[PDB]
Enzyme design. Structure first.
Site, PDB file in Angstrom:
ATOM      1  N   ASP A 111       0.842  -1.227   0.000  1.00 21.16           N
ATOM      2  CA  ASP A 111       0.000   0.000   0.000  1.00 21.16           C
ATOM      3  C   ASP A 111       0.860   1.254   0.000  1.00 21.16           C
ATOM      4  O   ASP A 111       1.219   1.787   1.044  1.00 21.16           O
ATOM      5  CB  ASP A 111      -0.922  -0.052   1.226  1.00 21.16           C
ATOM      6  CG  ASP A 111      -1.993   1.031   1.185  1.00 21.16           C
ATOM      7  OD1 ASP A 111      -1.908   1.926   0.309  1.00 21.16           O
ATOM      8  OD2 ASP A 111      -2.889   0.999   2.037  1.00 21.16           O
ATOM      9  N   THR A 112       1.191   1.771  -1.214  1.00 22.78           N
ATOM     10  CA  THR A 112       2.065   2.962  -1.268  1.00 22.78           C
ATOM     11  C   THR A 112       1.378   4.216  -0.765  1.00 22.78           C
ATOM     12  O   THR A 112       2.072   5.192  -0.481  1.00 22.78           O
ATOM     13  CB  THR A 112       2.545   3.191  -2.709  1.00 22.78           C
ATOM     14  OG1 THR A 112       1.416   3.336  -3.579  1.00 22.78           O
ATOM     15  CG2 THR A 112       3.406   2.000  -3.179  1.00 22.78           C
ATOM     16  N   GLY A 113       0.047   4.180  -0.609  1.00 27.72           N
ATOM     17  CA  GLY A 113      -0.707   5.338  -0.074  1.00 27.72           C
ATOM     18  C   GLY A 113      -0.762   5.343   1.464  1.00 27.72           C
ATOM     19  O   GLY A 113      -1.487   6.207   2.022  1.00 27.72           O
TER      20      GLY A 113
HETATM   21  C1  LIG Z   1      -1.310  11.152   2.211  1.00 28.09           C
HETATM   22  C2  LIG Z   1      -1.323  11.445   3.548  1.00 28.09           C
HETATM   23  C3  LIG Z   1      -2.002  12.395   4.176  1.00 28.09           C
HETATM   24  O1  LIG Z   1      -1.763  12.182   5.534  1.00 28.09           O
HETATM   25  C4  LIG Z   1      -1.401  10.875   5.622  1.00 28.09           C
HETATM   26  C5  LIG Z   1      -1.115  10.118   6.902  1.00 28.09           C
HETATM   27  N1  LIG Z   1      -1.862   8.833   6.881  1.00 28.09           N
HETATM   28  C6  LIG Z   1      -3.201   8.794   7.498  1.00 28.09           C
HETATM   29  C7  LIG Z   1      -1.266   7.768   6.393  1.00 28.09           C
HETATM   30  O2  LIG Z   1      -0.190   7.746   5.815  1.00 28.09           O
HETATM   31  C8  LIG Z   1      -1.969   6.431   6.497  1.00 28.09           C
HETATM   32  C9  LIG Z   1      -1.598   5.478   7.444  1.00 28.09           C
HETATM   33  C10 LIG Z   1      -2.185   4.231   7.431  1.00 28.09           C
HETATM   34  C11 LIG Z   1      -3.195   3.934   6.479  1.00 28.09           C
HETATM   35  C12 LIG Z   1      -3.554   4.885   5.537  1.00 28.09           C
HETATM   36  C13 LIG Z   1      -4.616   4.584   4.463  1.00 28.09           C
HETATM   37  O3  LIG Z   1      -5.613   4.073   4.806  1.00 28.09           O
HETATM   38  N2  LIG Z   1      -4.256   4.972   3.214  1.00 28.09           N
HETATM   39  C14 LIG Z   1      -5.234   4.923   2.100  1.00 28.09           C
HETATM   40  C15 LIG Z   1      -5.043   6.224   1.299  1.00 28.09           C
HETATM   41  C16 LIG Z   1      -5.282   7.390   2.238  1.00 28.09           C
HETATM   42  C17 LIG Z   1      -4.183   8.187   2.555  1.00 28.09           C
HETATM   43  C18 LIG Z   1      -4.351   9.217   3.529  1.00 28.09           C
HETATM   44  C19 LIG Z   1      -5.594   9.506   4.091  1.00 28.09           C
HETATM   45  C20 LIG Z   1      -6.685   8.722   3.710  1.00 28.09           C
HETATM   46  C21 LIG Z   1      -6.529   7.659   2.788  1.00 28.09           C
HETATM   47  C22 LIG Z   1      -4.973   3.641   1.283  1.00 28.09           C
HETATM   48  O4  LIG Z   1      -3.715   3.754   0.557  1.00 28.09           O
HETATM   49  C23 LIG Z   1      -6.110   3.434   0.240  1.00 28.09           C
HETATM   50  N3  LIG Z   1      -7.304   2.949   0.904  1.00 28.09           N
HETATM   51  C24 LIG Z   1      -7.673   1.536   0.889  1.00 28.09           C
HETATM   52  C25 LIG Z   1      -6.825   0.669   1.873  1.00 28.09           C
HETATM   53  C26 LIG Z   1      -7.068   1.037   3.335  1.00 28.09           C
HETATM   54  C27 LIG Z   1      -7.232  -0.797   1.595  1.00 28.09           C
HETATM   55  S1  LIG Z   1      -8.591   3.968   0.956  1.00 28.09           S
HETATM   56  O5  LIG Z   1      -8.030   5.325   0.847  1.00 28.09           O
HETATM   57  O6  LIG Z   1      -9.422   3.605   2.113  1.00 28.09           O
HETATM   58  C28 LIG Z   1      -9.572   3.671  -0.476  1.00 28.09           C
HETATM   59  C29 LIG Z   1      -9.220   4.226  -1.679  1.00 28.09           C
HETATM   60  C30 LIG Z   1     -10.023   3.993  -2.773  1.00 28.09           C
HETATM   61  C31 LIG Z   1     -11.185   3.253  -2.686  1.00 28.09           C
HETATM   62  C32 LIG Z   1     -12.022   3.063  -3.977  1.00 28.09           C
HETATM   63  O7  LIG Z   1     -11.472   1.860  -4.589  1.00 28.09           O
HETATM   64  C33 LIG Z   1     -11.572   2.711  -1.463  1.00 28.09           C
HETATM   65  C34 LIG Z   1     -10.745   2.922  -0.350  1.00 28.09           C
HETATM   66  C35 LIG Z   1      -2.871   6.119   5.490  1.00 28.09           C
HETATM   67  N4  LIG Z   1      -0.995  10.487   4.421  1.00 28.09           N
END
Ligand SMILES: Cc1coc(CN(C)C(=O)c2cccc(C(=O)N[C@@H](Cc3ccccc3)[C@H](O)CN(CC(C)C)S(=O)(=O)c3ccc(CO)cc3)c2)n1
Ligand SMILES: [Cl-]
Ligand SMILES: [Cl-]
Ligand SMILES: [Cl-]
Ligand code: NA
Ligand code: NA
EC number: 3.4.23.16
Lengths: 99, 99
Positions: free
Chosen positions: B25-27
């Site tokens: 998960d690069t996000g």
């Molecule tokens: C980019 C950035 C802003 O602040 C942050 C800090 N932060 C909360 C994180 O790095 C962090 C830590 C642990 C988990 C996640 C995290 O859940 N990251 C998601 C992308 C994302 C990034 C930042 C905020 C909200 C969502 C993740 O990469 C994509 N996600 C799915 C995953 C949980 C199976 S998702 O965003 O929920 C998602 C995306 C797209 C769909 C439609 O297909 C459905 C769900 C992100 N990063």
């Protein structure tokens, strides 16, 4: 390019005539963009992740330019805290994960 | 390997002697795994995902194998739709995005 993962993989995109910053996100099936207008038909959808679900508008056949590469596909629009380029568009620019 | 993104980038991980499936998960900055028992002390952390904030348990310096690559680092335990390997351990296994 080769993008390091020491930092968030943010790039510039152009969508609907607008420049935005977005994450290249291998963990997202679909692309999700913060609220904006897009032309054409849409339908409602619920998408979920950590923290639960948000309601989005699903727009199909939308062109994005991602770091200079053009791709077309579905874009979901709604109250996401970050713009996300998901796998549906990452594939189209030939992005891979390598290690 | 070179992993394309037409499918979810699911891999096997090994933590606590147990095999589990997880999503590269690069996000995600951080690694988040479903409820399980880990040794040592934990610290609190809040993470804001797409649908809101959750509390997780942060365990540091945990041994975890990812797709056959050894890592030792922070694992967050809490309620996530799927186990996610974030950038803190993707960097340990040498991953980059390429297009
Ligand atoms: C980019 C950035 C802003 O602040 C942050 C800090 N932060 C909360 C994180 O790095 C962090 C830590 C642990 C988990 C996640 C995290 O859940 N990251 C998601 C992308 C994302 C990034 C930042 C905020 C909200 C969502 C993740 O990469 C994509 N996600 C799915 C995953 C949980 C199976 S998702 O965003 O929920 C998602 C995306 C797209 C769909 C439609 O297909 C459905 C769900 C992100 N990063
Ligand atoms: Cl699509
Ligand atoms: Cl391909
Ligand atoms: Cl770590
Ligand atoms: Na359309
Ligand atoms: Na520890």
């Amino acid at each position: 390019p080769q993008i390091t993962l020491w930092k968030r993989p943010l790039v510039t995109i152009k969508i609907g005539g607008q420049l935005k910053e977005a994450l290249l996100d291998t963990g997202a099936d679909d692309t999700v963009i913060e609220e904006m207008s897009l032309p054409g038909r849409w339908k409602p959808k619920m998408i979920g992740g950590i923290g639960g679900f948000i309601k989005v508008r699903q727009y199909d056949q939308i062109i994005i330019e991602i770091a200079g590469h053009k791709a077309i596909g579905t874009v979901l629009v709604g109250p996401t805290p970050v713009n996300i380029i998901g796998r549906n568009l990452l594939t189209q620019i030939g992005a891979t994960l390598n290690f």
